């Protein structure tokens, strides 16, 4: 780290009116009560009403930026139809340097922390001047908060129990 902090790239309030946002799960929990990760969001329909999205951001802060997102892989289809109302997955998280799309399916798995389902997590750095776009037909995890930073040099990582 030379600089590192947390800001609110897309505030949960007013980012996603047209998708119901507040849904969470019970493994991600706090003192025996359900939750989900602070920095991110789920999105789903407005009473089973999915429109598909295009959104973007580019830097004004003039510092480097660190961004995270995810891609939904349900363990069953009834969720997928019920939430998002497409068997089609097509997402496109795009930049100048980086760009990648996603089109997954159901893929059943064993219970792991009482979960079969999966969300594969995906991330990138994003510099000043460059723009990012998200496009999607659902099956997303979005940024609520994002990590502002400068670079650092020479510090690192330890494993230790002492």
């Amino acid at each position, epitope marked *: 780290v030379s600089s590192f902090e947390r800001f609110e790239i897309f505030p949960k309030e007013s980012s996603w009116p047209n998708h119901t946002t507040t849904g*969470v799960s019970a493994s991600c929990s706090h003192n025996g009560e359900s939750s989900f990760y602070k920095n991110l969001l789920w999105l789903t329909g*407005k009473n089973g009403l999915y429109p598909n999205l295009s959104k973007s951001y580019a830097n004004n802060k003039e510092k480097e930026v660190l961004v995270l997102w995810g891609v939904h892989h349900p363990p069953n289809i009834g969720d997928q139809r*019920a939430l998002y109302h497409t068997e089609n997955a097509y997402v496109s998280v795009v930049s100048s340097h980086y760009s990648r799309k996603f089109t997954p399916e159901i893929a059943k798995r064993p219970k792991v922390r009482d979960r079969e389902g999966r969300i594969n997590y995906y991330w990138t750095l994003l510099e000043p001047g460059d723009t990012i776009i998200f496009e999607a037909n659902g099956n997303l995890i979005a940024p609520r908060y994002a990590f502002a930073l400068s670079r650092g040099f020479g510090s690192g990582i330890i494993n230790s129990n002492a």
Partner: single-chain antibody
Amino acid sequence: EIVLTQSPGTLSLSPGERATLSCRASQSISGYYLTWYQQKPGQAPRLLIYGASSRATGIPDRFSGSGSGTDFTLTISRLEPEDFAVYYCQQYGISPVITFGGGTNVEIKGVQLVESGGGLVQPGGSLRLSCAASGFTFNIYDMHWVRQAPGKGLEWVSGLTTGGDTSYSGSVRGRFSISRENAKNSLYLQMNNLRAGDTAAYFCVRGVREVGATGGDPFYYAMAVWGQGTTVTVSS
């Protein structure tokens, strides 16, 4: 959340007949948003229909509806004297507040919960209820406490998502207080400052699969299942 208005609160019709019922509100309100019930007095509610179209488990095909926005509608293909009953209209606010149509009698002319503690208190006093869970994962679902006077339109007292966003009514709030336990498989409702508006029957109610877990458990934005309720009264 918004005032509903059923249509009619009571009707009288003959065998071999349809029955149109229209529950409509102030504003236009998105249509996978309501669910539709029946009750035999003496019995708890039973679930029938949701989202203005679609049909619950263990069923005929006769109760069927339509409608959208401001006006939601449940129609009926055939009437029978076993259907003698009051049908209800329960909608999940976006202000996360259930609202209730006031029951609709059909007259025909010629796994489980368990509540705990219903009974008497003094008015202005203090008492608690609980519910306890049997045979599922009380982790997941969004829960609701509900009220019902005898042979009257319902009212919704309280509910809470599994993250902690409460919803009460502005009149009921503060005098009651909810609190939840998943490891213990039970729910709690400490209640104080109690007047004759509470002179009625109550229910503990299990609603919505939040987003995710393992199971053979899909979701609606209707209920899952109910409890047998219990009576509560202030009296001196």
